[PDB]
Amino acid sequence: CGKTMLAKAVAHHTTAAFIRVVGSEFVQKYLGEGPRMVRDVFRLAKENAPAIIFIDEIDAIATKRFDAQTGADREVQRILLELLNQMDGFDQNVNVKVIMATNRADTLDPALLRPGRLDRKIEFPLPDRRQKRLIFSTITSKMNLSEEVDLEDYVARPDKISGADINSICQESGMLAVRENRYIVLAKDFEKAYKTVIKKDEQEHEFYK
Amino acid sequence: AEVKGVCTEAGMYALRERRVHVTQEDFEMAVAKVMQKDSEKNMSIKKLWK
Amino acid sequence: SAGFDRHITIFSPEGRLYQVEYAFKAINQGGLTSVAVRGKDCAVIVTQKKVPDKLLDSSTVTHLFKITENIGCVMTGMTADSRSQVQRARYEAANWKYKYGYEIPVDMLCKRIADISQVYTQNAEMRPLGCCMILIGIDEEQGPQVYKCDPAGYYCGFKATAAGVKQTESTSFLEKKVKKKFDWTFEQTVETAITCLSTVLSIDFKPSEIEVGVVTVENPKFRILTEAEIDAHLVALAERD
Amino acid sequence: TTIAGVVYKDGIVLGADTRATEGMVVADKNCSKIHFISPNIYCCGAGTAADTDMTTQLISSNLELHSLSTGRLPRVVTANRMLKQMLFRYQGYIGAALVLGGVDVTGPHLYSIYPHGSTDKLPYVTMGSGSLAAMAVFEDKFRPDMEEEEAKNLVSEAIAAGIFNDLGSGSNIDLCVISKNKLDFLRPYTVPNKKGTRLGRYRCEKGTTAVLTEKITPLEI
Amino acid sequence: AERGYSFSLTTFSPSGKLVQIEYALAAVAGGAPSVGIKAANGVVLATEKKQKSILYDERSVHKVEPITKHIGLVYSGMGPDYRVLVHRARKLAQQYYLVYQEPIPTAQLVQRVASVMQEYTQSGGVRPFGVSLLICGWNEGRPYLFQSDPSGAYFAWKATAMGKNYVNGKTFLEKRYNEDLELEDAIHTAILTLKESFEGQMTEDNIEVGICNEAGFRRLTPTEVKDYLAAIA
Amino acid sequence: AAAAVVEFQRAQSLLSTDREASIDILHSIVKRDIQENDEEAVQVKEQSILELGSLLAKTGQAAELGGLLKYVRPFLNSISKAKAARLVRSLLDLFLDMEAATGQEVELCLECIEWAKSEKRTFLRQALEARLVSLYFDTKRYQEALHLGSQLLRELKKMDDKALLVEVQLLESKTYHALSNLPKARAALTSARTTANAIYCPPKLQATLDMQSGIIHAAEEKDWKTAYSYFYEAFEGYDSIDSPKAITSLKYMLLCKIMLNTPEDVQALVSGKLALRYAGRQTEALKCVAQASKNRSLADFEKALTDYRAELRDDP
Amino acid sequence: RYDSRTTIFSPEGRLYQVEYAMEAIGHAGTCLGILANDGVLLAAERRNIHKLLDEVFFSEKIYKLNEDMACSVAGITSDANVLTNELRLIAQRYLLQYQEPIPCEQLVTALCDIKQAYTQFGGKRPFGVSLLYIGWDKHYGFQLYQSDPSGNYGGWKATCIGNNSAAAVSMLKQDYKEGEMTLKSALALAIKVLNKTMDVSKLSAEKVEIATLTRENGKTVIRVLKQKEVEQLIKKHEEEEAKAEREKKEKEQKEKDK
Ligand SMILES: Nc1ncnc2c1ncn2[C@@H]1O[C@H](COP(=O)(O)OP(=O)(O)O)[C@@H](O)[C@H]1O
């Protein structure tokens, strides 16, 4: 629904630094390498005065309190514990910031979710009708479009698409228009892309529903 | 931690409306925004136990 | 999430029955393919026919069976499981006629086999037989009936169905064809079916390596069209198109 | 106990009497010997009341489950087959003789199911105590393809003959007209025998036989 | 987490949780949208009937079926399991009718279907019925709406929704639901709660609605449902 | 009450053709008394007064409002006004909504509020107060509008009719923006929207919230894209409801498309499927002003501004 | 690992799955029970009164096993229904055979033998249920027992099972008159313990269920207190605590004056 993009946009209108990592990058293999990388990341954040640290997918490491009865769940919990220490600890950060995107937001640890010195919460829901109209406007102003290509009748139609979906609709419509060799897209192009990336979530087994 | 967050969120609410004062209702909204007790809506999983 | 895969009665944490899905995968493993289309007053089923040896007898090799006089079936899946399911359907049809005293509607016959398969998917016995069974018949009130009885428990009624390897392309083509004047004649339905199979296969059909069966509101019997009928339809209709 | 049934132009017309004798004593005056197997199938029971009632109920339950499964009204061949097969599985101890009738997509039907499980499709059927007189009247005054009113009059006169010529026959003549359009259940259509018109009042005034003990209990509201 | 204790159904967990029934409920939630509303003088059940094509004859398999002319039943979850439960529910209703000459009270029918689910959720080789049932009924004079879950648990509802987006359905019903909602408006509320969950155009033929009032449970025909949809839109 | 319904229908025919006869017949129906057990007659006569108010709207005949607010109150405490207060709501709304000035103006609304105070029916007292606040805003007495709104919302945070809470909050936001305290108007709008995201928002209230959101964003944040988005949501809602004030929403839409320095889209919007029934000098004025902005011709710009007065001279 | 089967003994002699069920009972609702010379009572915590649910069943956790006995259930709902049905069947079987309402001890022993069979036989998980039985029997008058999943039952003057049941029983120990408590005092104490154990510090009729058994006119009466009486008790207790708080404030004022 657009959170990587708002992160990149703050990076655009940022003045300090935007250090991006993916939770897998901490989930790397070899004991203590994940904590090593988290500590290196936060140390870089600090050595830079106002820098920002972004973690793209935290559900991999940020988990609940599972009593690790193996050698691997224990290491994942170790990654999370090192993250907690670095975010808050005996070495209170100096003007450093942290951003996370999780995509689940339910099984995160109560620690990392500590509604205190560790995190605030924000919502990024499915583009409503308003947001979706803005999606169309922002994506499509750059393209070249006909006069019978009204987007306002591609929003009122109920549909549980997102911002990525609408970008894909527009890109696929333009691709199809060029394939059929016109330099102006048309309502047929948008119809075809609409049906190409709305019903794509199909071919499922029907006995489940 | 919740207490710190409540004070901080009341302060940010004050920051919102070009104001340098925090009021009781602002603290209340801060409490609501900080102590978000997410609850499972799956009534079946919730009624499994009598 | 591959640990919830070795038993037909253990759910996955995301609510999926993997060994129910694998029965459909077995359908696709059948190798052959089948299609069916229902018109205003007719119902036609078309099906592959592979005879990869000169000693195989085309008289025996066939996947269009006669469950009873008025109801016929096309199989898509392992042949042994298909024939067991065919025997079961024959049994249930006969028992229905014996108890309730009138020919079983296709509705109920497909329902009944669907429920047998459902019993097998729930109680951890058997091994859900891997065949997809498409039934055709004549119903006095509604008219022609085409139904499909997947090996997980759906007995759904179809305006035009496809089963087997080319199911997706067949369904696409049938949607495209149906969207134009669904009121089809006997010959037009026979065509629609044969043309759908030919196009989804990128092949042209010999009059023998295809099995076609038909029922009609004037002929309520499962007529397995012979070599003559298959050849005539193919050649003449492709020519006159 | 006398029941009768005829098939007319549009459907079926069934007619039973109202009496069930436990010996030579008239236990009931207004028994319900026509029973509902489905919205278009009614069954007239004669013989042992308990078994006819329970057999009709079980068959109605099976046929209603069948109807809710099919979506189409049950057809009388199924009712007849279930009845006969059950009554034969029980080698005859179910003293229920059932004039089954109905109207289905294939027109009317009127079966007669004897206790042992022998069935006989027929235009007119009477079986029971007074089937004697009922069938006499039918044979003497039946003409194929009657209309509603004439069929009703015929199957009422037959039951009247049963009433007036068979001990243990009823006091009221109940009818059931079944067709694709109507399901009339006349209960009772006619009252051949009304009452004796009791003579001068002879009650016993308040206070005629005192008591020995009382435990009047104050049950709540 | 409690990993080992999730492949069976006769083995508790340290938390005390039987994982397999919760998985079944996940399967249930991963099903079609269905909504139920208890009006002041009736009950309304609706359920998305969307097919994967125009090929499926969308009149052959219904989803809102009767169990008597005062009780009816709709579902979310799987379909074969649903057919089995509907068959057994009709059988239980008729058994009760024979034993006691009185149409089965909806509470008792719900209790017995729940007992059936319990039978199926308590042995080492029986898969819990993955389907959750909404049972509508009219007993005495008070409409009843119950929910039966794979766990053998039965519970009353003023109004609910189940399927892929039950959270959204239930918040919408919470907003729009008032006790004295006569049936003609309960139908609109149910259809709207289906709209807020129903991708694509809610044509009159891809939606199934069944209403249970004093006259007896009845599944609305395509003409009636089309009329209602046009009125709402 | 078939005979009474026939009398009411012939009164409607007289409304169509000879209105005075309809007025007299409805007045007689009102004068008719009602039983103490049944309610069919009171239903008939309340519909009769509704159509009498319709007659007053059609003919500007507000002279009866004194009676309709003085002599009908006594009997009205018979149909459990706790739920029938919608009737008084409609009566007062239509009254104050006729084309001609009511003369009494706030006087009659205050009389109604005092009558409700005597009745001790707070449920309707709240509605009367909210409508009075709207009247104050319409007459531009923003200060007293704001005062009553603050009192009423302080009361409504602890009582029922959260829809009326949203109404009063939006009235306060409109008054705040009129007084030009944009930060406080935005605060009121955010409160109204948070309270609206917990209850059912009819199309009218949802579109009003969207329009006010558009006005506030247009004024303050200079995020005219979001301003246009909200304005268009309001326009679609008002078009769906068939509401008089959809032309205003469309004008704001065109205004956003102009102030974004993209005047080429004004014509596209005006010649747009939805925005045909609303065609007229209102939209042609934005057309001309956007043409002037496109050609960067201040002469034509001022020409249009003077030529389209009352289309771009009055809406603040 | 000695917990994959009910019938498996651990090397330290513990039936793990039995302990698993016993601890699982904690996650259920909260039931407490008090015996008094005049009567007996149970209290139950309605965990879930989401306003879109309904109140069709007057009792969602307390059941009437026969005219002389009631039982509160806590645990898995399916097992709860199964066990309550078996309890009713046992009671009426005893009535048929002997013609005297079953002694509460005998009924509890029967059901707990059923649970023992389950914990000792084949592939059947132990019933994940704990029950509190109240009743009257001609042998030992009023009586209250608690039965666990392991089939073990204890006769308790007062007791509690469920969430924070340890705290509930601690407060029962503190405030229970071992031989003098009457029914009204029992209700007061039950309300106090419920208020202190329920997660919400504020009680109401929307979260509690009280059941009272008393012998009147020679016959037993099992009454589930209506919301009116429930709210009156909740009030009386809350205002009593408020009066105690006012007395504490007066004591603080006196100390300040000193
Ligand atoms: N509001 C928006 N405006 C334009 N594009 C959007 C918007 N929201 C999402 N997108 C599209 O989504 C893609 C980025 O999605 P992303 O933020 O990575 O989602 P996630 O990170 O949750 O998978 C971009 O390619 C962009 O085109």
Ligand SMILES: [Mg+2]
């Ligand atoms: Mg990203």
